[PDB]
Amino acid sequence: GSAYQDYLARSRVGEGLALAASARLAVAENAASGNGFSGGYVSPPATRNVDSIRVDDDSGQIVVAFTTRVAAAGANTLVLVPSAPDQADTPTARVALSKGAVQAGAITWECFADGKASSSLPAPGAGPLPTDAPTLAGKLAPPECRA
């Protein structure tokens, strides 16, 4: 809407992504120990900015769902995608996380908003795409989430 309304919404999206850091933490810790990526993790209680944060147990992808005070229903999600290198010295490509593998290489997170149709990850290569299409408008998301 108005410039102030977008400014307010962007600040709230930023707060919601800080909340989701605990899910990205859980995924990375589970990757290091070879456990399912949502193991030990439960979404925080709803806030007035974030309806839910969910973690896929097999890919580690995270869906952050914002409330209607941030964006409309069906237009309110960001997706955070983790990936690992094929090898952690001069890497060749990027792969989705593998349940049960002990992940030595560091895990890279890529954010996706609506309209980001492809990964922007640099060398060693493109990362995986969101399984569930994110629907939050790019102008409400941080720049790294946008197309």
PDB file of C-alpha atoms in Angstrom:
ATOM      1  CA  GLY A   1       0.000   0.000   0.000  1.00  0.00           C
ATOM      2  CA  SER A   2       1.289   3.397   1.056  1.00  0.00           C
ATOM      3  CA  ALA A   3       5.017   3.869   1.515  1.00  0.00           C
ATOM      4  CA  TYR A   4       4.611   3.786   5.287  1.00  0.00           C
ATOM      5  CA  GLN A   5       2.527   0.613   5.147  1.00  0.00           C
ATOM      6  CA  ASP A   6       5.222  -1.111   3.068  1.00  0.00           C
ATOM      7  CA  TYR A   7       7.924   0.170   5.418  1.00  0.00           C
ATOM      8  CA  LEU A   8       6.007  -1.224   8.398  1.00  0.00           C
ATOM      9  CA  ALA A   9       5.407  -4.551   6.704  1.00  0.00           C
ATOM     10  CA  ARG A  10       9.095  -4.904   5.757  1.00  0.00           C
ATOM     11  CA  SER A  11      10.165  -4.300   9.348  1.00  0.00           C
ATOM     12  CA  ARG A  12       7.731  -6.966  10.538  1.00  0.00           C
ATOM     13  CA  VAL A  13       8.954  -9.434   7.897  1.00  0.00           C
ATOM     14  CA  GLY A  14      12.473  -8.812   9.170  1.00  0.00           C
ATOM     15  CA  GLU A  15      11.375  -9.552  12.731  1.00  0.00           C
ATOM     16  CA  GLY A  16       9.709 -12.747  11.525  1.00  0.00           C
ATOM     17  CA  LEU A  17      12.858 -13.903   9.750  1.00  0.00           C
ATOM     18  CA  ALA A  18      14.833 -13.364  12.939  1.00  0.00           C
ATOM     19  CA  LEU A  19      12.310 -15.627  14.674  1.00  0.00           C
ATOM     20  CA  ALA A  20      12.898 -18.256  11.983  1.00  0.00           C
ATOM     21  CA  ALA A  21      16.636 -18.280  12.725  1.00  0.00           C
ATOM     22  CA  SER A  22      15.943 -20.853  15.449  1.00  0.00           C
ATOM     23  CA  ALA A  23      14.575 -23.232  12.804  1.00  0.00           C
ATOM     24  CA  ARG A  24      17.605 -22.744  10.580  1.00  0.00           C
ATOM     25  CA  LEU A  25      19.739 -23.434  13.661  1.00  0.00           C
ATOM     26  CA  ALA A  26      17.851 -26.669  14.320  1.00  0.00           C
ATOM     27  CA  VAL A  27      18.252 -27.840  10.722  1.00  0.00           C
ATOM     28  CA  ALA A  28      21.990 -27.166  10.753  1.00  0.00           C
ATOM     29  CA  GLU A  29      22.505 -28.954  14.080  1.00  0.00           C
ATOM     30  CA  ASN A  30      20.531 -31.960  12.859  1.00  0.00           C
ATOM     31  CA  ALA A  31      22.526 -32.045   9.618  1.00  0.00           C
ATOM     32  CA  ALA A  32      25.753 -32.166  11.617  1.00  0.00           C
ATOM     33  CA  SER A  33      24.514 -35.147  13.640  1.00  0.00           C
ATOM     34  CA  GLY A  34      22.781 -37.041  10.832  1.00  0.00           C
ATOM     35  CA  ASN A  35      19.253 -36.639  12.222  1.00  0.00           C
ATOM     36  CA  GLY A  36      16.001 -35.657  10.575  1.00  0.00           C
ATOM     37  CA  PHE A  37      16.091 -31.952   9.971  1.00  0.00           C
ATOM     38  CA  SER A  38      13.061 -31.037  12.098  1.00  0.00           C
ATOM     39  CA  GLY A  39      14.187 -33.263  14.984  1.00  0.00           C
ATOM     40  CA  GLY A  40      13.791 -31.505  18.316  1.00  0.00           C
ATOM     41  CA  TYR A  41      12.210 -28.431  16.708  1.00  0.00           C
ATOM     42  CA  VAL A  42       8.730 -27.054  17.180  1.00  0.00           C
ATOM     43  CA  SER A  43       7.358 -23.826  15.728  1.00  0.00           C
ATOM     44  CA  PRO A  44       7.244 -20.858  18.125  1.00  0.00           C
ATOM     45  CA  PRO A  45       3.757 -19.874  19.284  1.00  0.00           C
ATOM     46  CA  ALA A  46       1.980 -17.548  16.876  1.00  0.00           C
ATOM     47  CA  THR A  47       2.942 -13.872  17.049  1.00  0.00           C
ATOM     48  CA  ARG A  48       1.118 -10.949  15.509  1.00  0.00           C
ATOM     49  CA  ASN A  49       3.628 -11.065  12.629  1.00  0.00           C
ATOM     50  CA  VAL A  50       4.191 -14.825  12.136  1.00  0.00           C
ATOM     51  CA  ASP A  51       1.484 -17.456  11.948  1.00  0.00           C
ATOM     52  CA  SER A  52       3.850 -20.435  11.758  1.00  0.00           C
ATOM     53  CA  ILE A  53       7.350 -21.616  10.969  1.00  0.00           C
ATOM     54  CA  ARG A  54       7.641 -25.148   9.675  1.00  0.00           C
ATOM     55  CA  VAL A  55      10.633 -27.322   8.902  1.00  0.00           C
ATOM     56  CA  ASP A  56      10.637 -30.122   6.348  1.00  0.00           C
ATOM     57  CA  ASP A  57      12.187 -33.189   7.975  1.00  0.00           C
ATOM     58  CA  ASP A  58      13.743 -34.490   4.742  1.00  0.00           C
ATOM     59  CA  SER A  59      15.010 -31.365   2.993  1.00  0.00           C
ATOM     60  CA  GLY A  60      15.368 -28.871   5.812  1.00  0.00           C
ATOM     61  CA  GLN A  61      13.442 -26.273   3.852  1.00  0.00           C
ATOM     62  CA  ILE A  62      11.620 -23.779   6.027  1.00  0.00           C
ATOM     63  CA  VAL A  63       8.332 -22.027   5.304  1.00  0.00           C
ATOM     64  CA  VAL A  64       7.680 -18.796   7.207  1.00  0.00           C
ATOM     65  CA  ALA A  65       4.004 -17.812   7.101  1.00  0.00           C
ATOM     66  CA  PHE A  66       3.197 -14.200   7.943  1.00  0.00           C
ATOM     67  CA  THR A  67      -0.098 -12.970   9.350  1.00  0.00           C
ATOM     68  CA  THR A  68      -2.705 -10.929   7.479  1.00  0.00           C
ATOM     69  CA  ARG A  69      -1.422  -7.786   9.209  1.00  0.00           C
ATOM     70  CA  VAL A  70       1.758  -8.268   7.141  1.00  0.00           C
ATOM     71  CA  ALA A  71       0.324  -9.662   3.871  1.00  0.00           C
ATOM     72  CA  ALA A  72      -2.838 -11.311   2.575  1.00  0.00           C
ATOM     73  CA  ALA A  73      -3.557 -15.024   2.870  1.00  0.00           C
ATOM     74  CA  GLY A  74      -1.963 -16.930  -0.008  1.00  0.00           C
ATOM     75  CA  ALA A  75       0.445 -14.000  -0.489  1.00  0.00           C
ATOM     76  CA  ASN A  76       2.337 -14.303   2.812  1.00  0.00           C
ATOM     77  CA  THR A  77       5.142 -16.886   2.682  1.00  0.00           C
ATOM     78  CA  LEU A  78       8.926 -16.893   2.483  1.00  0.00           C
ATOM     79  CA  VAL A  79      10.930 -20.076   1.975  1.00  0.00           C
ATOM     80  CA  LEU A  80      14.451 -20.683   3.274  1.00  0.00           C
ATOM     81  CA  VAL A  81      16.367 -23.412   1.421  1.00  0.00           C
ATOM     82  CA  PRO A  82      19.528 -25.087   2.801  1.00  0.00           C
ATOM     83  CA  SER A  83      22.171 -26.762   0.681  1.00  0.00           C
ATOM     84  CA  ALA A  84      25.657 -28.196   1.053  1.00  0.00           C
ATOM     85  CA  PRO A  85      28.681 -28.285  -1.249  1.00  0.00           C
ATOM     86  CA  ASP A  86      29.748 -31.467  -2.980  1.00  0.00           C
ATOM     87  CA  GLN A  87      33.104 -30.991  -1.153  1.00  0.00           C
ATOM     88  CA  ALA A  88      34.257 -28.182   1.137  1.00  0.00           C
ATOM     89  CA  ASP A  89      37.494 -27.182  -0.667  1.00  0.00           C
ATOM     90  CA  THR A  90      37.085 -25.655  -4.146  1.00  0.00           C
ATOM     91  CA  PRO A  91      33.510 -26.977  -4.445  1.00  0.00           C
ATOM     92  CA  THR A  92      31.903 -28.085  -7.706  1.00  0.00           C
ATOM     93  CA  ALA A  93      28.103 -27.969  -7.225  1.00  0.00           C
ATOM     94  CA  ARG A  94      25.431 -27.633  -4.520  1.00  0.00           C
ATOM     95  CA  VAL A  95      23.127 -30.365  -3.222  1.00  0.00           C
ATOM     96  CA  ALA A  96      20.033 -30.527  -1.058  1.00  0.00           C
ATOM     97  CA  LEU A  97      20.448 -31.865   2.441  1.00  0.00           C
ATOM     98  CA  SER A  98      20.390 -35.637   2.863  1.00  0.00           C
ATOM     99  CA  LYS A  99      18.629 -37.175   5.860  1.00  0.00           C
ATOM    100  CA  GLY A 100      21.046 -39.445   7.690  1.00  0.00           C
ATOM    101  CA  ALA A 101      24.249 -38.067   6.165  1.00  0.00           C
ATOM    102  CA  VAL A 102      26.683 -36.459   8.604  1.00  0.00           C
ATOM    103  CA  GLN A 103      27.157 -33.031   7.052  1.00  0.00           C
ATOM    104  CA  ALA A 104      30.758 -31.831   7.360  1.00  0.00           C
ATOM    105  CA  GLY A 105      30.601 -29.016   4.807  1.00  0.00           C
ATOM    106  CA  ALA A 106      28.953 -25.786   5.884  1.00  0.00           C
ATOM    107  CA  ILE A 107      25.284 -25.285   5.076  1.00  0.00           C
ATOM    108  CA  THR A 108      24.247 -22.317   2.950  1.00  0.00           C
ATOM    109  CA  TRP A 109      20.767 -20.781   3.282  1.00  0.00           C
ATOM    110  CA  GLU A 110      18.972 -19.127   0.367  1.00  0.00           C
ATOM    111  CA  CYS A 111      15.800 -17.068   0.818  1.00  0.00           C
ATOM    112  CA  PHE A 112      12.987 -16.997  -1.757  1.00  0.00           C
ATOM    113  CA  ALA A 113      10.040 -14.609  -2.111  1.00  0.00           C
ATOM    114  CA  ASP A 114       7.348 -14.554  -4.772  1.00  0.00           C
ATOM    115  CA  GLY A 115       8.809 -14.187  -8.252  1.00  0.00           C
ATOM    116  CA  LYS A 116      12.271 -15.533  -7.458  1.00  0.00           C
ATOM    117  CA  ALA A 117      12.146 -18.270 -10.077  1.00  0.00           C
ATOM    118  CA  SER A 118      15.767 -19.442  -9.886  1.00  0.00           C
ATOM    119  CA  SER A 119      18.550 -19.667  -7.353  1.00  0.00           C
ATOM    120  CA  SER A 120      21.088 -16.830  -7.357  1.00  0.00           C
ATOM    121  CA  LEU A 121      23.770 -18.815  -5.540  1.00  0.00           C
ATOM    122  CA  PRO A 122      27.335 -18.236  -6.822  1.00  0.00           C
ATOM    123  CA  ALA A 123      30.171 -20.693  -7.352  1.00  0.00           C
ATOM    124  CA  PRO A 124      30.013 -23.601  -6.605  1.00  0.00           C
ATOM    125  CA  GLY A 125      26.557 -23.344  -8.281  1.00  0.00           C
ATOM    126  CA  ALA A 126      22.812 -22.912  -8.014  1.00  0.00           C
ATOM    127  CA  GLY A 127      21.009 -24.173  -4.943  1.00  0.00           C
ATOM    128  CA  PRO A 128      17.745 -26.106  -4.791  1.00  0.00           C
ATOM    129  CA  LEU A 129      14.434 -24.393  -5.413  1.00  0.00           C
ATOM    130  CA  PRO A 130      11.571 -24.069  -2.906  1.00  0.00           C
ATOM    131  CA  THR A 131       9.343 -27.119  -2.772  1.00  0.00           C
ATOM    132  CA  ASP A 132       6.391 -24.943  -1.725  1.00  0.00           C
ATOM    133  CA  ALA A 133       6.273 -21.777  -3.805  1.00  0.00           C
ATOM    134  CA  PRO A 134       6.717 -18.682  -1.627  1.00  0.00           C
ATOM    135  CA  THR A 135       4.057 -16.054  -2.063  1.00  0.00           C
ATOM    136  CA  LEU A 136       5.126 -12.961  -0.101  1.00  0.00           C
ATOM    137  CA  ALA A 137       5.636 -10.068  -2.488  1.00  0.00           C
ATOM    138  CA  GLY A 138       9.302  -9.404  -3.131  1.00  0.00           C
ATOM    139  CA  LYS A 139       8.994  -5.730  -2.216  1.00  0.00           C
ATOM    140  CA  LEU A 140       8.107  -6.746   1.336  1.00  0.00           C
ATOM    141  CA  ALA A 141      11.082  -9.132   1.669  1.00  0.00           C
ATOM    142  CA  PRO A 142      14.798  -8.427   2.161  1.00  0.00           C
ATOM    143  CA  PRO A 143      16.660  -7.883  -1.110  1.00  0.00           C
ATOM    144  CA  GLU A 144      18.342 -11.302  -1.089  1.00  0.00           C
ATOM    145  CA  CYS A 145      14.900 -12.957  -1.241  1.00  0.00           C
ATOM    146  CA  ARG A 146      13.808 -11.186  -4.424  1.00  0.00           C
ATOM    147  CA  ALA A 147      14.217 -12.101  -8.095  1.00  0.00           C
TER     148      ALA A 147
END
